[PDB]
């Protein structure tokens, strides 16, 4: 009864129903079984969680929960009252029950309370009823669990939801201790790893946390999340989680890129990984996803290979991308020789830049316009920079026969990137 | 009051 | 009759029909008259301009063209075939005419051929038929004009479309002479100014260009275009274009931000201008915009916030007063950090309050009822808030006793060019 | 090319 698939749990523009349907379809195509609805900026999920869905919102949610069941995908509805709830006030608890009930009648069986990313104290009223913050959440969570009649799947996301976030440490936290103790055994606990965006999930970390949580956790995986960085996209393979974790977890739900179509790899390689141990090779799964993705788009598999390597993983570039970085660094470090070697590498380098240009022009000429659009700004960015980098390599080579400086004359605005934000960044060390 |  | 409005002419995700419709509402309400359809990455507009609209697309366009007529906005359909067209080939020409006619019957009466951003020479089969590149675009443009019966509005965007793009200069450019003289006296020419994003469009430059092309040009204004940088948005007032340019031009069409909702200022202030103080016009625009932001209705965002937002994402060549101010203050504090006579800390305190206001602005914007607007600006406002809060803390690090992948790969290469921060 |  193991849970694997997607959480829509990011900040930003949420997906539309047509995307969420195309999503379910893909999940079943690849044998995943679960979807957690938790978009941070759908205002009635978090910002105004007390509020009931309007008439047209109701029709939409129902149509969607339909399609979930129609595709045997388990639909889990999340709610994030963490910000401003009064735990001790019962009218508050009533409002929360009335809200969850309203969703119950859409066809919704699975539920989740999330208490991620909120102030660690409570109001004067609560300090009386509850001995700690931890108590308060648990008390309200259980109350709901039972009110729902102990439903099929029911998730809880704690405030200390990863290693960094446990105070003062992971295995000595009052908060996580009391959760382990008091949260009812049929309620599952969500965990993101040792960090918010975990590079690696050691089995030892899971073991250490399972002992305090007194159960196996479902991972909220932020591996492919790109909401915290405007320039960042992650088309790399699912990686840094041993296949040997599967028996030791209740699930993994991936929180992926905001841009729906960018998540092909992110979801595929998670499928492959789950289906391998229901080892696994990141390099190899990547090969599999890129080939099968290439169908959906003129554009070559090599162009995709390049693209994935340019936007790979939060802590890693792809082979072809890391290569270009080293090469540019050497070329700039050893520029002052302007002797036999340097130029051939520059010629070779200006070539690899060409491949980025070509990758862009073919992607723009492609037939799948939805996919283009999700990525357009991301790939135009790399094209722009690569062309300036090609240009700068050219200029460095031309130093022996010219004393003109790199930018000549008056510049168009894209000579100087980033606007105000970029200006404040350059002032940090 | 967000992810960090 | 003078043309003023918006051109949807940028690279990236084009606006959807429902947004364009809303554009028509806004142009009329603000007493503007024109919309030039030219989205570079709409499929059938440019890359595969040869392909005819399906039945479903057909339904969608004429519905949109009807709406245009419904709101007394002149609809101009543009087409960008310059990429791989062969000029001499009749099959190509029929394909052009046939594409055009298909849109006529959708209810269209105004057209544009755009040749911006294409290679200067032709295929061998074109090299003999026409003496120069110019002669060759002119020919096909004229022919298309007459083919549809010399319609009321017809626009042509030249390859040398700005001061910098002309060889070896504007006033003495072969390509421009041929346009001026051989292009039919009743067709209009598009022009972006001295440069592609013109900081100013001075009067003298318009005289210099009108002489050589023999007519007053329509400005394609890129002042508010933001397609060329992920991190950039322009919510500042229409600026750098004297009201004295009006007598000397057939029109101004602004090419504005990719994110639809962000263009309220960009369009409102162009209107204001058309009827001039950049700061007075910003205030009028921000003031009217505030009303579009509500709290959502519940059964269980301020003007100073907008002023702050605009100052932070202002114009391509200029930050807004508050933005510059915080950037000055942050510079002085980082310079004078050695102190830790008295003053610095009194000023560190005021600065963390400014940062506070950025965080505040984001929070309130996050609770607003108009999610369309939020979503359009989200990643832009998120970014600024993250960086500010980090700048806030870092300022504190200096007071106290105590992302190498930021921007990913692109960020990393960018930090290796010397030209980074060549504008601070 | 592009506007460049
Ligand atoms: C914290 O950060 C991630 C990535 O920015 C965001 O999508 C997520 O909603 C937040 N909460 C959790 C439990 O990861
Ligand atoms: C040139 O650049 C602008 C901004 O990058 C782009 O939107 C526009 O499509 C291009 N063409 C013209 C004539 O400005």
Distance of CA A116 from the midpoint of ligand 1 (Å): 8
- What is the C-alpha to C-alpha distance for residues A222 and A213, in angstroms, rounded to an integer? 20
3-state secondary structure of C302: coil
D contact set with C (CB within 8 A) = 1-4
Query: Would you tell me how many other CB atoms lie within 10 Å of the CB of residue C341?
Result: 5
- Nearest Cα to Cα of residue A272 among A281, A259, A261, A260: A281
- Nearest Cα to Cα of residue A189 among A112, A110, A273, A289: A112
- C-alpha distance from residue A218 to each of A27, A132, A208, C343 (Å): 18, 25, 15, 52
Query: Would you tell me how many other CB atoms lie within 10 Å of the CB of residue A156?
Result: 24
- What is the C-alpha to C-alpha distance for residues A78 and A14, in angstroms, rounded to an integer? 14
Spell out the domains of chain C, with CATH numbers in brackets: 1-277 (3.20.20.80), 278-424 (no CATH)
Max intra-chain CA distance, chain C? 80
Residue A412 contacts D where some CB pair is shorter than 8 Å: yes
- What is the C-alpha to C-alpha distance for residues A391 and A404, in angstroms, rounded to an integer? 14
- Nearest Cα to Cα of residue A230 among C416, C84, C162, C259: C259
What residues form DSSP beta bridges with A3?
A251
Q: Are C262 and C26 in contact (CB under 8 A)?
A: no
- What is the C-alpha to C-alpha distance for residues C262 and C350, in angstroms, rounded to an integer? 29
Test mutation, A12, A117, A198, A255, chain B, max B CBs within 10 A? A117
DSSP assigned state of C419: T
Sign (positive or negative) of CA dihedral A192, A196, A197, A200: negative
Nearest-5° angle of CA C54, CA C57, CA C63?
140
Distance of CA C20 from the midpoint of ligand 2 (Å): 19
- What is the C-alpha to C-alpha distance for residues A43 and C206, in angstroms, rounded to an integer? 50
Q: Where are the alpha helices (DSSP H) in A119-258?
A: 124-129, 133-147, 174-182, 203-213
Strands C110-114 and A188-191: unpaired
Query: Would you tell me how many other CB atoms lie within 10 Å of the CB of residue C83?
Result: 14
Interhelix angle C321-335/C371-399, nearest 10 degrees: 20
The tokens for C165 are 């793009």
Place of tokens 């009812």: A184
Interhelix angle A340-364/A301-310, nearest 10 degrees: 110
Inter-chain CB proximity C423 and A410 less than 8 Å: no
- Nearest Cα to Cα of residue A265 among A301, A238, A228, A232: A238
Query: Would you tell me how many other CB atoms lie within 10 Å of the CB of residue A191?
Result: 27
- What is the C-alpha to C-alpha distance for residues C255 and A398, in angstroms, rounded to an integer? 37
3-state secondary structure of A169: coil
Residue C118 contacts D where some CB pair is shorter than 8 Å: yes
- What is the C-alpha to C-alpha distance for residues A258 and A11, in angstroms, rounded to an integer? 8
Which residues line the pocket of ligand 2, CB cutoff 6 A? C 9-11, 40, 116-117, 157, 161, 192, 196, 220, 222, 225, 227-228, 255; D 3
- Nearest Cα to Cα of residue A251 among A12, A74, A19, A106: A74
- What is the C-alpha to C-alpha distance for residues C277 and A365, in angstroms, rounded to an integer? 43
- Nearest Cα to Cα of residue A75 among A114, A36, A28, A19: A36
| Per-residue exposure over C275-291, b if at least 16 CB sit within 10 Å of its own CB, e if not | eeebeebbbbbbeebee
Inter-chain CB proximity C296 and A416 less than 8 Å: no
Strands A3-8 and C110-114: unpaired
Place of tokens 């938790």: A38
Residue A298: is it exposed, middle or buried by C-beta count within 10 angstroms (0-12/13-18/19+)? Answer: exposed
What residues form DSSP beta bridges with C110?
C76
What residues form DSSP beta bridges with A154?
A111
- What is the C-alpha to C-alpha distance for residues C270 and C238, in angstroms, rounded to an integer? 6
Please tell me the total number of residues recorded for chain C in this structure.
Answer: 424
Residue closest via CA to ligand 1's atom 10 equals B3
Q: What is the DSSP string of C112-127?
A: EEE--S--SS--HHHH
- What is the C-alpha to C-alpha distance for residues A193 and A172, in angstroms, rounded to an integer? 16
Closest to A230 (Cβ–Cβ): which among C231, C313, C419? C231
Calculate the CA A240 to chain-centre distance.
15
Q: What method was applied to determine this entry?
A: X-ray
What residues form DSSP beta bridges with A221?
A254
Q: Are C86 and C123 in contact (CB under 8 A)?
A: yes
Q: Are A158 and A176 in contact (CB under 8 A)?
A: yes
Residue A12: is it exposed, middle or buried by C-beta count within 10 angstroms (0-12/13-18/19+)? Answer: middle
- C-alpha distance from residue C315 to each of A45, A377, C14, C265, C289 (Å): 36, 20, 22, 11, 18
- What is the C-alpha to C-alpha distance for residues C110 and C107, in angstroms, rounded to an integer? 10
Q: Where are the alpha helices (DSSP H) in A190-229?
A: 203-213
3-state secondary structure of A253: strand
Residue closest via CA to ligand 2's atom 5 equals C228
- What is the C-alpha to C-alpha distance for residues A72 and A68, in angstroms, rounded to an integer? 6
Closest to C409 (Cβ–Cβ): which among A317, A406, A422? A317
- What is the C-alpha to C-alpha distance for residues A158 and C423, in angstroms, rounded to an integer? 45
Half-sphere exposure of A154 (CA within 13 A, CB side): 19
Which residues line the pocket of ligand 1, CB cutoff 6 A? A 9-11, 40, 116-117, 157, 161, 192, 196, 220, 222, 225, 227-228, 255; B 3
Place of tokens 């094209």: A383
To test the ligand 1 pocket, which listed residue (A8, A42, A225) has its Cβ within 8 A of the most ligand atoms? A225
């Amino acid at each position: 009864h193991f849970l694997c698939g997607v959480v829509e749990g990011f900040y930003g523009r949420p997906w539309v129903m047509e995307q969420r349907k195309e999503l379910f379809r893909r999940l079943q195509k690849w044998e995943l079984n679960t979807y957690l609805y938790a978009p941070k900026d759908d205002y009635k999920h978090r910002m105004f969680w007390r509020e009931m869905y309007s008439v047209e919102e109701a029709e939409q949610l129902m149509t969607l929960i339909s399609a979930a069941r129609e595709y045997e995908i388990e639909f889990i509805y999340a709610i994030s009252p963490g910000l401003d709830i009064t735990f001790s006030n019962p009218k508050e608890v009533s409002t929360l029950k009335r809200k969850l009930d309203q969703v119950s009648q859409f066809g919704c069986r699975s539920f989740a309370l999330l208490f991620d990313n909120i102030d660690h104290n409570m109001c004067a009223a609560d300090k009386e009823v509850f001995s700690s913050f931890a108590h308060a959440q648990v008390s309200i969570t259980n109350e709901i669990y039972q009110y729902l009649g102990e439903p099929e799947t029911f998730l809880f996301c704690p405030t200390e939801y990863c290693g960094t976030f446990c105070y003062p440490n992971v295995s000595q936290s009052p908060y996580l201790r009391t959760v382990g103790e008091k949260l009812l055994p049929g309620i599952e606990v969500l965990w993101t790893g040792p960090k918010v965006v975990s590079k690696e999930i050691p089995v030892e970390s899971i073991e250490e946390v399972s002992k305090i949580i007194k159960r196996a956790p479902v991972i909220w995986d932020n591996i492919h999340a790109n909401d915290y960085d405007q320039k960042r996209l992650f088309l790399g393979p699912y990686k840094g989680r041993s296949t040997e974790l599967i028996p030791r977890l209740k699930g993994v739900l991936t929180n992926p890129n905001c841009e729906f179509e960018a998540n092909y790899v992110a979801i595929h390689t998670l499928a492959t990984w789950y289906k391998s141990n229901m080892l696994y090779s990141p390099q190899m799964a990547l090969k599999l996803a890129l080939t099968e993705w290439l169908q959906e788009f003129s554009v070559t598999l090599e162009d995709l290979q390049l693209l994935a390597d340019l936007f790979y993983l939060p802590y890693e570039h792809g082979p072809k991308g890391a290569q270009m970085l080293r090469e540019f660094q050497w070329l700039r470090a050893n520029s002052s020789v302007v002797i036999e070697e340097w130029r051939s590498r520059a010629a070779k380098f200006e070539e690899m830049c060409g491949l980025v240009m070509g990758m862009f022009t073919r992607l723009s000429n492609c037939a799948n316009r939805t996919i283009l659009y999700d990525m357009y700004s991301y790939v135009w960015d790399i094209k722009s920079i690569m062309s300036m980098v090609k240009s700068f390599v050219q200029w460095l080579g031309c130093r022996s026969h010219s004393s003109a400086q790199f930018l000549i004359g008056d510049q168009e605005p894209w000579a100087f990137r980033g606007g105000l934000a970029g200006e404040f960044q350059r002032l940090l060390p | 009051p967000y992810s960090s």
